User: Which sequence fits this backbone?
């Protein structure tokens, strides 16, 4: 109701070389929490117990605000927050002077908002090229979960009810949040993000022929950030950890299917043409030329789906490498960049449901069917041609 | 107590604008058009008093779109009056089409009248916010550098894990590589170097050391190894350079007019028939 004569102005930001590709380019709003404007009212004037409903009505406004990531009037940002800081933490004060109905349940929603903020910033932080494609594709998915499920449901529905329903209740607020089960989904994304951060901090922390006749050697090197094999391992681990929640299972399955489309394209294309095309250097192995006769190949163990410690996963990996090399030499000798489909009888398909293939009992079946294809065509090559 | 809570709350806030008129003003300004509450000074917005912090932040979030619109408009108006590379105006025309599409989408939203509150406007355009944002970030240095720099950058971006960035980069890349395909055709079919303005890796050398090295002992065409974009294999680049030098050598001194012309027309048809593949294996075969 008052005026604080604050020059609130909107203008784009001057610096461009430190804000990621999707980073927002508008100046941050003016800091009500320390630079107040136009009202500083303490509800102690209206802290009468009968006014309790009236009080929460005001409260409702502010809470219906924070969930979109913008702080409410009767919510102050903590002295820690600094808008020019991209990595500042998220914490903020709400007055205990009101009835607990103000404060108790609100803590649940604001956490949502807290994570709603970090995800958004993550939605930006992972947009950089050096983070490889998988998270980058993952970036897309997180955005959708906000602008098609969180907002279009919650914001639309909540505003409609607060404008139409006679005295909509915060209890009904919780009931409609969970009746659309969004919170659990958002929590799954949250915890996956926490594990990603854990792996990043681990890698930022500690910087420091006999039988199969393969002309191969390990290249064990660590990069500051996790890559696709790590991410897929992670999703497998989480789905394993939460067997039983049918909705959780279906959601995570859709995630796995959605993220690795062209990754599966790359793997299938290599197993059926021996051609490796990884402009981000995320695939399992990589070639020389960092003449093409000693085509020595190296394992980047840091991106493999398995510890490759026992005999069976080593067997799988080595069959993979051999199959690729065989098809590659076939192409090199016949002077054709592509292998026609109808050269043989064993026909192979793409990994249309990577979710179950990752579990086991089908991974090796696919691998050794491709191995059979490779052996038959290769032997026909050096026996007839 | 069968009453409306927002009605229980609104007259408590006495000195603020009816949110309906807030919508009224935001719809005009969304295209960075000044009006009663928000006079753009062509560079910023003055948000007046009687506006809660909430409304200020949301107006920040929304008006990002108008700021981007104005900046991109300045870019477009600034370059349509200049003399620059053809790929540059390829970027200009694509950005202009994007701006027109944004105009159409915004005014269609205004006409159909599905806007009811600020957050609705937020969710409706957030995608177009991102689209404008990416379009802005991709051209931060249009004024200084050359196009083939952008060709390489866009080629790299074609594999970006984002679907939206996928589509945008592919479109821009396709248009410029069609024009660059025209450059390559011109070199392979006539051996000229006209109107390339330093975006092509095969250069002509007018030099004074050895004043007769354009008369007898030399052919002043030069392959600069470092200037080949990543979508062309190096050995095929050598092949291309030798093809052009071959054509020059036959035409200028050998005088193989009939053979060179018939060969040229045949291969002219052969490439011009495949322009819809761009850069691909078939082209390498020819």
Assistant:
């Amino acid at each position: 109701m008052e005026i604080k004569e604050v020059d609130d102005r909107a203008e784009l930001l001057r610096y461009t070389n430190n804000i990621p590709l999707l980073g927002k380019l508008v100046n941050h709003q003016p800091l009500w929490s320390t630079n107040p404007k136009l009202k500083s009212f303490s509800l102690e004037k209206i802290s009468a117990p009968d006014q309790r409903r009236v009080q929460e009505a005001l409260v409702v406004k502010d809470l219906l605000n924070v969930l979109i990531g913008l702080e409410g009037t009767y919510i102050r940002y903590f002295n820690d927050y600094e808008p020019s800081d991209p990595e500042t933490p998220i914490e903020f004060k709400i007055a205990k002077k009101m009835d607990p109905s103000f404060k108790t349940f609100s803590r649940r929603i604001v956490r949502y908002g807290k994570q709603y903020m970090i995800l958004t910033r993550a939605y930006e932080k992972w947009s950089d090229t050096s983070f490889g494609m998988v998270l980058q594709r993952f970036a897309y998915e997180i955005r959708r979960f906000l602008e098609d499920v969180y907002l279009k449901t919650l914001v639309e529905r909540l505003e409609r009810d607060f404008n139409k329903v006679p005295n909509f209740s915060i209890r009904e607020l919780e009931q409609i949040i969970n009746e659309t089960e969004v919170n659990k989904q958002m929590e799954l994304l949250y915890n996956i993000y926490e594990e990603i951060f854990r792996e990043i901090e681990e890698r930022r922390t500690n910087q420091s022929s006999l039988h199969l006749r393969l002309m191969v050697a390990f290249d064990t090197t660590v990069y500051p950030v996790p890559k696709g094999g790590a991410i897929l391992k992670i999703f497998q681990q989480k789905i394993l950890e939460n067997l039983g929640d049918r909705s959780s299972v279906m959601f995570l399955k859709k995630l796995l299917n959605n993220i690795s489309q062209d990754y599966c394209t790359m793997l299938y294309e290599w197993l059926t043409q021996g051609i490796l095309n990884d402009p981000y250097q995320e695939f399992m192995t990589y070639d020389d030329l960092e003449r093409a006769w000693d085509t020595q190949y190296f394992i980047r163990k840091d991106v493999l789906l398995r510890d490759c410690d026992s005999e069976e996963d080593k067997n799988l990996l080595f069959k993979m490498l051999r199959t690729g090399i065989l098809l590659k030499v076939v192409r090199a000798s016949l002077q054709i960049p592509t292998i026609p489909s109808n050269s043989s009888d064993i026909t192979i398909q793409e990994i249309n449901d990577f979710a179950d293939l990752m579990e086991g009992s089908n991974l090796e079946l696919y691998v050794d069917k491709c191995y059979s294809r490779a052996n038959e065509i290769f032997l026909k090559l050096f026996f007839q041609g | 107590s069968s009453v409306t809570l927002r009605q229980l709350s609104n007259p408590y806030y006495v000195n603020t604008i009816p949110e309906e008129d807030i919508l009224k003003y935001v719809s005009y300004t969304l295209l960075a058009t000044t009006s009663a509450l928000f006079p753009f000074d062509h560079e910023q917005i003055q948000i007046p008093s009687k506006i809660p912090n909430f409304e200020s932040g949301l107006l920040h979030l929304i008006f990002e779109a108008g700021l981007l619109y104005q900046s991109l408009g300045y870019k477009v108006e600034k370059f349509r009056m200049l003399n620059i590379s053809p790929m540059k105006k390829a970027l200009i025309i694509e950005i202009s089409e994007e701006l027109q599409n944004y105009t159409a989408f915004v005014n269609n939203l205004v006409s159909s009248g599905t806007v009811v509150s600020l957050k609705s406007l937020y969710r409706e355009i957030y995608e177009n916010i991102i689209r404008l944002r990416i379009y802005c970030r991709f051209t931060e240095h249009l004024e200084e550098l050359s196009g083939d720099t952008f060709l390489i950058e866009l080629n790299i971006f074609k594999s970006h894990g984002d679907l939206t960035i996928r589509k945008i980069a592919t479109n821009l890349f396709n248009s410029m590589i069609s024009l660059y395909y025209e450059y390559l055709m011109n070199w392979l079919t006539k051996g000229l170097l006209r109107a390339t303005y330093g975006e092509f890796f095969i250069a002509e050398n007018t030099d004074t050391n050895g004043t007769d090295d354009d008369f007898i002992y030399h052919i002043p065409i030069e392959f600069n190894q470092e200037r080949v974009p990543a979508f062309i294999p190096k050995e095929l680049a050598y092949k291309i350079f030798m093809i052009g030098k071959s054509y020059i050598f036959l035409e200028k001194y050998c005088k193989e007019v009939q053979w060179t012309n018939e060969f040229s027309k045949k291969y002219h048809v052969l490439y011009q028939s495949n322009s819809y593949r761009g850069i691909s294996t078939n082209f390498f075969e020819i």
